[PDB]
Design an enzyme around this catalytic site. Sequence first.
Site, mmCIF file in Angstrom:
data_model
loop_
_atom_site.group_PDB
_atom_site.id
_atom_site.type_symbol
_atom_site.label_atom_id
_atom_site.label_comp_id
_atom_site.label_asym_id
_atom_site.label_seq_id
_atom_site.Cartn_x
_atom_site.Cartn_y
_atom_site.Cartn_z
ATOM 1 N N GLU A 64 6.675 -3.354 5.008
ATOM 2 C CA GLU A 64 6.158 -3.546 3.662
ATOM 3 C C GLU A 64 6.837 -4.742 3.000
ATOM 4 O O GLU A 64 8.010 -5.033 3.247
ATOM 5 C CB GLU A 64 6.377 -2.279 2.832
ATOM 6 C CG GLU A 64 5.817 -2.334 1.422
ATOM 7 C CD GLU A 64 4.320 -2.561 1.404
ATOM 8 O OE1 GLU A 64 3.567 -1.591 1.635
ATOM 9 O OE2 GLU A 64 3.898 -3.715 1.168
ATOM 10 N N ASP A 92 5.103 1.119 6.632
ATOM 11 C CA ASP A 92 6.092 0.525 5.738
ATOM 12 C C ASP A 92 7.389 0.152 6.441
ATOM 13 O O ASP A 92 8.023 -0.842 6.074
ATOM 14 C CB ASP A 92 6.413 1.482 4.588
ATOM 15 C CG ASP A 92 5.226 1.726 3.685
ATOM 16 O OD1 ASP A 92 4.567 0.746 3.278
ATOM 17 O OD2 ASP A 92 4.959 2.908 3.380
ATOM 18 N N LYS A 118 -3.141 10.866 2.959
ATOM 19 C CA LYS A 118 -2.577 9.741 3.697
ATOM 20 C C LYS A 118 -2.794 9.899 5.197
ATOM 21 O O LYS A 118 -3.095 8.921 5.892
ATOM 22 C CB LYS A 118 -1.088 9.593 3.379
ATOM 23 C CG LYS A 118 -0.371 8.569 4.246
ATOM 24 C CD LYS A 118 1.028 8.267 3.727
ATOM 25 C CE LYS A 118 0.984 7.440 2.452
ATOM 26 N NZ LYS A 118 0.257 6.157 2.647
HETATM 27 O O1 LIG Z 1 0.942 -0.620 2.586
HETATM 28 C C1 LIG Z 1 -0.020 -0.320 1.881
HETATM 29 N N1 LIG Z 1 -1.113 -1.073 1.756
HETATM 30 C C2 LIG Z 1 -1.329 -2.278 2.541
HETATM 31 C C3 LIG Z 1 -1.523 -1.999 4.019
HETATM 32 S S1 LIG Z 1 -3.063 -1.197 4.395
HETATM 33 O O2 LIG Z 1 -3.250 -1.239 5.816
HETATM 34 O O3 LIG Z 1 -4.081 -1.758 3.555
HETATM 35 C C4 LIG Z 1 -2.834 0.491 3.932
HETATM 36 C C5 LIG Z 1 -3.817 1.145 3.208
HETATM 37 C C6 LIG Z 1 -3.631 2.467 2.849
HETATM 38 C C7 LIG Z 1 -2.480 3.129 3.208
HETATM 39 C C8 LIG Z 1 -1.505 2.477 3.929
HETATM 40 C C9 LIG Z 1 -1.675 1.154 4.295
HETATM 41 C C10 LIG Z 1 -0.041 0.977 1.118
HETATM 42 N N2 LIG Z 1 -1.030 1.153 0.230
HETATM 43 C C11 LIG Z 1 -1.088 2.294 -0.459
HETATM 44 C C12 LIG Z 1 -2.205 2.443 -1.468
HETATM 45 C C13 LIG Z 1 -3.535 2.998 -0.923
HETATM 46 C C14 LIG Z 1 -4.291 1.733 -0.545
HETATM 47 C C15 LIG Z 1 -4.041 0.863 -1.752
HETATM 48 N N3 LIG Z 1 -2.631 1.153 -2.061
HETATM 49 C C16 LIG Z 1 -1.880 0.298 -2.774
HETATM 50 O O4 LIG Z 1 -2.385 -0.677 -3.327
HETATM 51 C C17 LIG Z 1 -0.392 0.484 -2.796
HETATM 52 C C18 LIG Z 1 0.252 1.517 -3.479
HETATM 53 CL CL1 LIG Z 1 -0.648 2.674 -4.384
HETATM 54 C C19 LIG Z 1 1.636 1.609 -3.437
HETATM 55 N N4 LIG Z 1 2.390 0.748 -2.760
HETATM 56 C C20 LIG Z 1 1.795 -0.240 -2.099
HETATM 57 C C21 LIG Z 1 0.418 -0.405 -2.089
HETATM 58 CL CL2 LIG Z 1 -0.277 -1.712 -1.207
HETATM 59 N N5 LIG Z 1 -0.153 3.278 -0.274
HETATM 60 C C22 LIG Z 1 0.869 3.130 0.637
HETATM 61 O O5 LIG Z 1 1.696 4.042 0.787
HETATM 62 C C23 LIG Z 1 0.906 1.931 1.346
HETATM 63 O O6 LIG Z 1 1.904 1.796 2.230
HETATM 64 MN MN LIG Z 2 3.472 3.369 1.892
HETATM 65 MN MN LIG Z 3 2.668 -0.043 3.042
#
Ligand SMILES: O=C(NCCS(=O)(=O)c1ccccc1)c1nc([C@@H]2CCCN2C(=O)c2c(Cl)cncc2Cl)[nH]c(=O)c1O
Ligand SMILES: [Mn+2]
Ligand SMILES: [Mn+2]
Length: 179
Positions: A64, A92, A118
């Site tokens: 991440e 992450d 998730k």
């Molecule tokens: O890494 C992530 N996203 C990019 C890789 S993905 O392959 O698109 C990806 C998509 C979904 C889940 C995991 C990876 C990720 N995303 C989420 C949630 C849901 C999707 C949008 N979202 C966010 O915007 C967000 C939030 Cl709420 C909190 N912190 C970071 C981010 Cl980006 N929740 C995570 O736990 C997380 O790890």
């Molecule tokens: Mn995450």
């Molecule tokens: Mn992530």
Amino acid sequence: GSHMEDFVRQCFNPMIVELAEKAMKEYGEDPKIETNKFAAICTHLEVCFMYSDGGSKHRFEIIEGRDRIMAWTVVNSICNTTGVEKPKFLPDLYDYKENRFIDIGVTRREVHIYYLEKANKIKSEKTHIHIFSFTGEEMATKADYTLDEESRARIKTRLFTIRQEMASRSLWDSFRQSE
Ligand SMILES: O=C(NCCS(=O)(=O)c1ccccc1)c1nc([C@@H]2CCCN2C(=O)c2c(Cl)cncc2Cl)[nH]c(=O)c1O
Ligand SMILES: [Mn+2]
Ligand SMILES: [Mn+2]
């Protein structure tokens, strides 16, 4: 110019604010408008950083925070050298001690509901899941919480402090319902 935006910039350190802004722009979102999402990404980033500081010196590889191309590059190198399955979605961290990827979740709801959500979205049976709540609860795959109790307790304490700071500014109700 929202009150939540100025709270986020004074609550988290500039490096986390910096990385959250770039991640929000990478997916076509603006921190000035989607401010609850801005606070959530900063919170999730800090938890990931604290989590990686939980183990030994170089136990965790941080996925991440990097841009999409470099994050997948590190995932490929980890997979093509340990033999672990390549996940469908970016995790992450990677635990070199337990040899598994981790997706950390932070939720304002029940840890039960977010885990089931998730797991369905990640669609990677091998990726370990660790959920944290703003109320002090946590839920991890196979009840395996990776870090010792004190490293997790510091994360939970920081999460509840973020909740209190928002509540004292009348920003928590809008933040809790925004999920
Ligand atoms: O890494 C992530 N996203 C990019 C890789 S993905 O392959 O698109 C990806 C998509 C979904 C889940 C995991 C990876 C990720 N995303 C989420 C949630 C849901 C999707 C949008 N979202 C966010 O915007 C967000 C939030 Cl709420 C909190 N912190 C970071 C981010 Cl980006 N929740 C995570 O736990 C997380 O790890
Ligand atoms: Mn995450
Ligand atoms: Mn992530």
